[PDB]
Symmetry: D2
Subunit: 242 residues, 4 copies
Amino acid sequence: IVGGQEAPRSKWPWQVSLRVHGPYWMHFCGGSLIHPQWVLTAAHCVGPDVKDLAALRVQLREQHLYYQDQLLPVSRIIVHPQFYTAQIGADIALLELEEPVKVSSHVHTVTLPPASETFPPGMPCWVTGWGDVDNDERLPPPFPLKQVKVPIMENHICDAKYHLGAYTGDDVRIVRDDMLCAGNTRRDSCQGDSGGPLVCKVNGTWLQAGVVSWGEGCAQPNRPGIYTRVTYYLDWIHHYVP
Amino acid sequence: IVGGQEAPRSKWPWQVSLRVHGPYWMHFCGGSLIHPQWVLTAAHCVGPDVKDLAALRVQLREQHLYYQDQLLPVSRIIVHPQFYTAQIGADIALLELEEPVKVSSHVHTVTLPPASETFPPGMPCWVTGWGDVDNDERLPPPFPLKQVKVPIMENHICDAKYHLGAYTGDDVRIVRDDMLCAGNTRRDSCQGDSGGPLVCKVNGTWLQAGVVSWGEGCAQPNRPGIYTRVTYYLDWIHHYVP
Amino acid sequence: IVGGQEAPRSKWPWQVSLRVHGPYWMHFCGGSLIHPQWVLTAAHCVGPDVKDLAALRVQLREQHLYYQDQLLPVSRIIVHPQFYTAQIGADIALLELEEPVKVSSHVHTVTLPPASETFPPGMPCWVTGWGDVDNDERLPPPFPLKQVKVPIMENHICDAKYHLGAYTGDDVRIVRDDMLCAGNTRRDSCQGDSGGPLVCKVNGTWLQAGVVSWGEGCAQPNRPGIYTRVTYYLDWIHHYVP
Amino acid sequence: IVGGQEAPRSKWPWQVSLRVHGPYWMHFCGGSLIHPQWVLTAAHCVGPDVKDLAALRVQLREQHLYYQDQLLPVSRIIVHPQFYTAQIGADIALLELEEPVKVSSHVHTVTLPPASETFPPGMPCWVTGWGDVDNDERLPPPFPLKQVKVPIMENHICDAKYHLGAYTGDDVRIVRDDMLCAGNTRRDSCQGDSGGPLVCKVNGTWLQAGVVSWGEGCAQPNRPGIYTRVTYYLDWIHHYVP
Ligand SMILES: NCc1ccc2c(c1)C1(CCN(C(=O)/C=C/c3ccccc3)CC1)CO2
Ligand SMILES: NCc1ccc2c(c1)C1(CCN(C(=O)/C=C/c3ccccc3)CC1)CO2
Ligand SMILES: NCc1ccc2c(c1)C1(CCN(C(=O)/C=C/c3ccccc3)CC1)CO2
Ligand SMILES: NCc1ccc2c(c1)C1(CCN(C(=O)/C=C/c3ccccc3)CC1)CO2
């Protein structure tokens, strides 16, 4: 997370960390609990290449990475069949936990938005995660969960911004309709935040508008952060999550 | 270049080296001389972000990189407007030399293929370059130009192979019509070969079938090297090159 | 620490962590509390180049590095004036805390040996710290404090060990009089443990026999770890420490 | 070499490059031909750990490393028995080539100094090699041999410099009598130059005053380069070299 601050311990009860087996169970991507037995994340964290379930674990909401891990096994990984790269799109995936979660006050699911919610500029949104605090700059121990308020922008503007300082024809789409843009040169998501959630407080309810996906660097001019647009994939999510 | 051997001094008089300004004029990509004043390379080598012509130079065929540099300024960098990533396609670009080359003894142009050439499996094809000799293994000094003979694989077969061991739907095209596949687990191009030529001897003449574009690693099982198919962009090339 | 295991919470109340300013107050060396206002460490941790005191902090015993830091400022650095390198000798230094420490129960001082003490061969002593777990292998987060039991090796025997497979003349002393050997190919201190204590239980009491100083690698054949011999420097220590 | 320039092709005919077996025969240290069959280098290049002769080769003067290699096998490695670290001293060694050289015009031994030659300040002196061009900044391809004129500094004056900004006692000698100092913040040797020749022109003749040994960084304030003083080791050299 670029800019922003360490999260209070009562906020973002839906945030998860994905761990890969190695010299230790290392954080590699974020995710969000959207159902007591299901985690929403980005496909580029787990695909397009199929990997071994046994080597993956999920850690639930934790103020400091690694401090008091309670790692959870995954029974299923479900990656959107349309996914190949983040720029092409469909950067979304689901993890079915071996067992449902004992939902607490410290840990619970985030609400998915109605298909109608567009998240227009002006909505108050936050992105959270344990990723780099800037380009090539790791989150320092003891790895607190971070949050940053980010401005949302309409897709046509974000797409046009990406063509500034680039060879790509203005008529050639860069930011697709299944994506959503947010951030500026001081507030952004970054490497390690991938898969994590962008949430917006709508009518008193925090809704997950997006999934940290990609961008050119972090907090770079005319290169806002790009998220997978959750509303686009409600149909797909509902094939699997009750 | 993975596999193969150091090139004879007489072979591949069209191979060029692209250099970027820094501590030294460092090789970052290959290219081919297709006109005394024009160099053909890959788009991802010089984009999609717009670069300054001053930090760029071109070096014509050398047996050993850096050892007899006569660097050449470039007056125009022309990048295919459809390009954004190598997976999406249109990974091709043109460099106009500030001044025409005088066709030397070890410096000639490569012939572009007629639109009729599909380059079926079984044809004799070489890729050349000064890139990595394997995944994350640099070409050792004194940096001899390498060549390797690579088996051509039909697009549809190559596309289906890229799906092997991936989540990506059989529905979804990975290797596109503007691309071409060649290489196996012992013969391939790699990082630093990008922008370089793939050449096939057809009826007594060497034609440039492809431009080194991308792939999943180098020389990996079921992941042959991917090239920009030159016949697909003849029109665009001819729009600029006499 | 090479080999051994995580230290129980009750043990080694004198162990401290030396921190350098930067992106975060990063641990670079160990040490020991020998008095409520004084920490014993290695000269090479804080020399021979004179350091900025404002860039230094001390952290009393912690089960896990970084989680719950309570960093203490330092008012004086005192480096033995004979120190230039660890191979030459005199690898010992003192840090004066700006304020006396409130001695606790899980933070006590360690007892220094009487002027005569020898610590005979074979005798089992303990070295502790947050250092690397092997050659080029960092202690994984959450960075638990490690301990390991290491056998003392008599100096002359150790010195000969250091001559095996070396050009250095037998009559040239490599392990010196102000040094002490301990460890084997399975149990040793390592980078990051430097400045930390080697302790022995003598007649029911833990005495600090040495300070982690140096060695040829960690736990390599014929190269036990070298510690600075505390008894050699008792007089110097007592000139500053009440 | 820090500062200075590429050497003319006719100069320093005695310069040699030491190579170790790897992906390629990589340069790791310098040295000088002091006899058709003998190379003088630093001990820290080859010791104090005993090394396999079949893993080492010598390259006689080349304008550019690796470019036109003719590697020469070594029959004996002779490391001064007193060597253990460069700061301690006796950083000198001798390599016996498997066979004598065919002393041409491009290759020619350098002359050793008479015992009484002291090399006082003001004397004209150059150091040459293929080492780093600055701290942590490698010599760029195509790796030309560099040269630089270095100011000689009296041991006692040099010693004083080394005490500035250091905790080391004034009475503790850092720069020993078997060492010689030269260079400043613009001109100095550096990593990879070690073992190579420091030559001074005395009464029209070039004499090798020093062997590149060590220093605190390269070209740092108050830290001249330190060399083994050749005069000091004449007797030991002559016990082996006719
Ligand atoms: N702040 C949004 C964001 C969040 C998480 C995250 C990133 C960006 C990455 C930053 C670094 N990366 C790039 O720079 C990609 C360059 C690129 C060049 C050309 C065409 C497309 C893309 C890959 C994405 C790594 O993880
Ligand atoms: N042998 C063909 C080839 C030639 C030159 C060259 C390469 C491959 C690169 C190898 C390393 N790279 C990857 O591994 C890309 C992985 C990838 C994963 C998922 C979807 C798309 C792509 C990027 C391409 C670097 O330059
Ligand atoms: N277990 C003992 C020990 C404890 C802590 C610690 C070390 C060793 C270091 C290990 C790596 N280093 C070396 O290998 C030194 C090689 C050397 C070569 C030639 C002459 C003398 C020495 C430097 C010391 C780093 O910190
Ligand atoms: N220009 C002189 C010179 C020539 C060749 C060469 C060097 C210096 C090295 C530079 C880096 N090094 C150090 O910084 C040593 C630090 C040190 C700290 C404390 C006490 C003694 C020493 C090791 C020597 C590498 O090879």
